[PDB]
Amino acid sequence: LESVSNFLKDFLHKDRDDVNVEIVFLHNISPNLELEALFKRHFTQVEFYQGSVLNPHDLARVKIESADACLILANKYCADPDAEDASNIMRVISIKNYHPKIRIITQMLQYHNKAHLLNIPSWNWKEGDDAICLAELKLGFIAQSCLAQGLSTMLANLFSMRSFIKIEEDTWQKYYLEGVSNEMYTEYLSSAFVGLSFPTVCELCFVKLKLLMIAIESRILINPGNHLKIQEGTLGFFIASDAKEVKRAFFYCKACSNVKKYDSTGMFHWCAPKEIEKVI
Amino acid sequence: ELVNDTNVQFLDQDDDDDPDTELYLTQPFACGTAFAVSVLDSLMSATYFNDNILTLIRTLVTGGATPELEALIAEENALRGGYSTPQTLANRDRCRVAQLALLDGPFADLGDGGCYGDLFCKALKTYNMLCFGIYRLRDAHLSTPSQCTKRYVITNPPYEFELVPTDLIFCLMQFD
Amino acid sequence: LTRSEAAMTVLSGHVVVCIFGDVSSALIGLRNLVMPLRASNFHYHELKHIVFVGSIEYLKREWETLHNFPKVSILPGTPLSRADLRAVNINLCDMCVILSANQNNIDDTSLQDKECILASLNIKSMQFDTTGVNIPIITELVNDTNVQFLDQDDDDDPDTELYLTQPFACGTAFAVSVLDSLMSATYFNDNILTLIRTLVTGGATPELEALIAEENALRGGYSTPQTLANRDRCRVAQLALLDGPFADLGDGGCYGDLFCKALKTYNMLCFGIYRLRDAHLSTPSQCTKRYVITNPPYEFELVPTDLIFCLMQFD
Ligand SMILES: [Ca+2]
Ligand SMILES: [Ca+2]
Numbered sequence: 001l002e003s004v005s006n007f008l009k010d011f012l013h014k015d016r017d018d019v020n021v022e023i024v025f026l027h028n029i030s031p032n033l034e035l036e037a038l039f040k041r042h043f044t045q046v047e048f049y050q051g052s053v054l055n056p057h058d059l060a061r062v063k064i065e066s067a068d069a070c071l072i073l074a075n076k077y078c079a080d081p082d083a084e085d086a087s088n089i090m091r092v093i094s095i096k097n098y099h100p101k102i103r104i105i106t107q108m109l110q111y112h113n114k115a116h117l118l119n120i121p122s123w124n125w126k127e128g129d130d131a132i133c134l135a136e137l138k139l140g141f142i143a144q145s146c147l148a149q150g151l152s153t154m155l156a157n158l159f160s161m162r163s164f165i166k167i168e169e170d171t172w173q174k175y176y177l178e179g180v181s182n183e184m185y186t187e188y189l190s191s192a193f194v195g196l197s198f199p200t201v202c203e204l205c206f207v208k209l210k211l212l213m214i215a216i217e218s219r220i221l222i223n224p225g226n227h228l229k230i231q232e233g234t235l236g237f238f239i240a241s242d243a244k245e246v247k248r249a250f251f252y253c254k255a256c257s258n259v260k261k262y263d264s265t266g267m268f269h270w271c272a273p274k275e276i277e278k279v280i
Numbered sequence: 281e282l283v284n285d286t287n288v289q290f291l292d293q294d295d296d297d298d299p300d301t302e303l304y305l306t307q308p309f310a311c312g313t314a315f316a317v318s319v320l321d322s323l324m325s326a327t328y329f330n331d332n333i334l335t336l337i338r339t340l341v342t343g344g345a346t347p348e349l350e351a352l353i354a355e356e357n358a359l360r361g362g363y364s365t366p367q368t369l370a371n372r373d374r375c376r377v378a379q380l381a382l383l384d385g386p387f388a389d390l391g392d393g394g395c396y397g398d399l400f401c402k403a404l405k406t407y408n409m410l411c412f413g414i415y416r417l418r419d420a421h422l423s424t425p426s427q428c429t430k431r432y433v434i435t436n437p438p439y440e441f442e443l444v445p446t447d448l449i450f451c452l453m454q455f456d
Numbered sequence: 457l458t459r460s461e462a463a464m465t466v467l468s469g470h471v472v473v474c475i476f477g478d479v480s481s482a483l484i485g486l487r488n489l490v491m492p493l494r495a496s497n498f499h500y501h502e503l504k505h506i507v508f509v510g511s512i513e514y515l516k517r518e519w520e521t522l523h524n525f526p527k528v529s530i531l532p533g534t535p536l537s538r539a540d541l542r543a544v545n546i547n548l549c550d551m552c553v554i555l556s557a558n559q560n561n562i563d564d565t566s567l568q569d570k571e572c573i574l575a576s577l578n579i580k581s582m583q584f585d586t587t588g589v590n591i592p593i594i595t596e597l598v599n600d601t602n603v604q605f606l607d608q609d610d611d612d613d614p615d616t617e618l619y620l621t622q623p624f625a626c627g628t629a630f631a632v633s634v635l636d637s638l639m640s641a642t643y644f645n646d647n648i649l650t651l652i653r654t655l656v657t658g659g660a661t662p663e664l665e666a667l668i669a670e671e672n673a674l675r676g677g678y679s680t681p682q683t684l685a686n687r688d689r690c691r692v693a694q695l696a697l698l699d700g701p702f703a704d705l706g707d708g709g710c711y712g713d714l715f716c717k718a719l720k721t722y723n724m725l726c727f728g729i730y731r732l733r734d735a736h737l738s739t740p741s742q743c744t745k746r747y748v749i750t751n752p753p754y755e756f757e758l759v760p761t762d763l764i765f766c767l768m769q770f771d
């Protein structure tokens with residue numbers, strides 16, 4: 001109940017669309033207590049089945065062959081994080097060993113265990129297999145909040161699918177629930193934007209078509225400088241009230257040196273390895 | 281960091297508390313003073329429906345760690361130092377997240393009740409600053425002054441939106 | 457050794473033993489791994505060097521059992537570390553052995569073999585200035601059903617007995633459950649366990665059992681003509697069918713002719729072939745995996761790629 005309830009109320013959220021995708025669950029234990037009730041509340045598109053993802057007959061029942069993606073949830077409160085991530089990697093290799101081409105999304109409790117996930121020969125992040133490391137993102141959101149307070153709640157509100165809620169009283173909740181109503185979305189830029197600099201299309205798409213643009217696929221960059229002009233076929237990341245609103249970004253066409261200061265690639269500052277007695 | 285998001289009710293006393301409220305509505309979360317790993321549960325569903333999202337979050341949050349960095353750390357288990365080169369130096373030229381105070385000379389004249397959209401347009405076109413939200417004082421809508429220093433987060437203000445001189449601007453700013 | 461010392465030590469043709477182990481964990485009995493590799497049938501230059509990679513805390517309470525064998529080293533580390541595997545030249549060994557002491561501390565069928573499966577995958581995925589998928593590995597499994605995770609170009613099914621599976625047929629997995637039929641084999645014929653013991657232990661005699669039972673350690677002695685005559689046993693070896701004395705018969709020619717000449721000219725007595733998994737296909741393949749043929753039936757063809765299992769004389 002404490003793991004599926006936050007997942008279900010976002011996946012089956014009314015504001016995205018009225019589509020049917022999620023229809024099956026599997027686990028070695030029976031779904032006793034206040035959990036079958038949460039399945040009753042979604043009867044037409046949940047269907048729990050009893051079986052273990054380590055067994056290829058149970059993978060064959062739930063039709064892993066054409067299951068689109070598999071989602072693996074971690075026990076966030078477990079006594080041994082490294083045993084959990086090894087266990088969930090056993091599930092990943094079980095699923096990939098049964099079927100090469102299913103997409104897999106998995107929670108990892110520790111950062112280092114994401115290396116092990118890259119050893120599997122049938123895993124490729126270039127085709128949308130990925131791991132959500134909870135320690136990496138948790139401590140990362142806190143770290144960026146040390147640069148700007150409130151950023152960790154800003155980011156956490158950009159993923160969760162939420163509708164706009166109207167408030168009539170002039171309290172702080174009125175302006176907050178307006179800002180909560182948007183999500184991170186992405187779309188390919190219209191050919192009308194090709195050949196001109198990123199700040200200029202940001203000002204155009206904010207002013208004329210009410211979309212905030214953040215980043216572009218120059219593999220993946222964030223708020224690129226005024227010297228960077230847009231190529232054809234670039235993906236462009238947006239903040240918007242709803243997915244149907246980002247479509248205008250595509251449909252628009254005029255109309256209306258002797259010492260080591262850094263790590264080996266210059267991404268981070270670095271120093272020679274200190275002794276702990278030097279920093280206590 | 282909270283292990284149980286229901287315990288968030290104890291972090292503040294000038295708030296209002298109720299066991300059925302979802303964490304995102306609560307004052308200490310809206311102000312950015314509490315975090316719980318349960319807010320990342322919806323990152324599973326967000327990443328299923330759009331694979332690009334987790335890539336953006338990762339680059340924005342980790343300090344821009346690349347697939348090459350993942351490989352070096354996976355081999356050597358520690359961050360390994362290197363000597364300067366023009367390419368090692370060009371790798372510094374990313375944006376970084378920052379807060380701007382609307383009491384400074386280049387923006388305070390627009391911090392008089394003037395529009396967020398005008399601030400966005402000029403800060404973007406003159407500095408490549410791209411603001412994406414404001415951190416407003418909890419009581420700034422009241423007619424009375426207050427001793428309350430708490431701020432709360434506004435994400436993507438809708439244009440025609442007023443700037444009080446007390447506001448802090450969330451922005452992405454260039455290296456130099 | 458520290459990593460730097462292992463890295464400048466030119467380890468090649470050696471054995472790497474990867475041990476998952478800890479101060480709480482039961483004794484593996486490593487003397488029994490080292491002794492067959494220290495038989496006086498080998499010349500001192502023919503001895504494969506042995507490196508233990510694992511917790512030193514664990515090795516520290518076993519090593520006095522194997523502190524009288526010559527070519528032995530320890531690297532304090534973890535088999536999941538690519539840096540440790542590189543420091544011991546894992547691309548150059550004749551075998552990598554993967555063991556766990558932690559077999560008995562949780563029983564959940566999944567939890568028993570995680571480390572060994574991750575370790576073998578971590579060695580397979582390596583890159584060197586070649587991929588690591590060609591490296592010879594043998595993995596001890598606590599649950600023979602977990603064998604399905606060791607390979608991915610195989611076919612897996614929960615009702616298959618271990619002996620049919622690709623990783624077992626290729627000689628890359630072992631499970632103590634295959635010795636359960638040694639009970640029934642030894643009831644029906646008492647001589648079998650005597651043969652297995654002499655063939656496998658490095659020929660330990662009843663006199664050796666008595667000396668070890670008294671003194672609890674292997675005790676050194678000075679040379680004598682009888683101590684030297686005791687070296688003249690056979691030893692098991694693999695012969696490559698690309699060498700001059702046999703390659704002319706490795707053209708599709710008969711195993712029986714190879715057996716007859718190798719027996720009569722060298723007293724070599726071959727007893728099986730290790731054939732490439734794909735050698736029956738008309739297409740070439742990149743697959744380096746071999747599988748075991750025991751007692752080939754005469755009139756049986758030798759492809760030039762085959763390795764011959766044989767018993768060869770001392771000299
Ligand atoms: Ca939202
Ligand atoms: Ca409270």
Ligand SMILES: [Ca+2]
Pocket residue numbers: 097603604605606607608609610611612
């Ligand atoms: Ca398999």
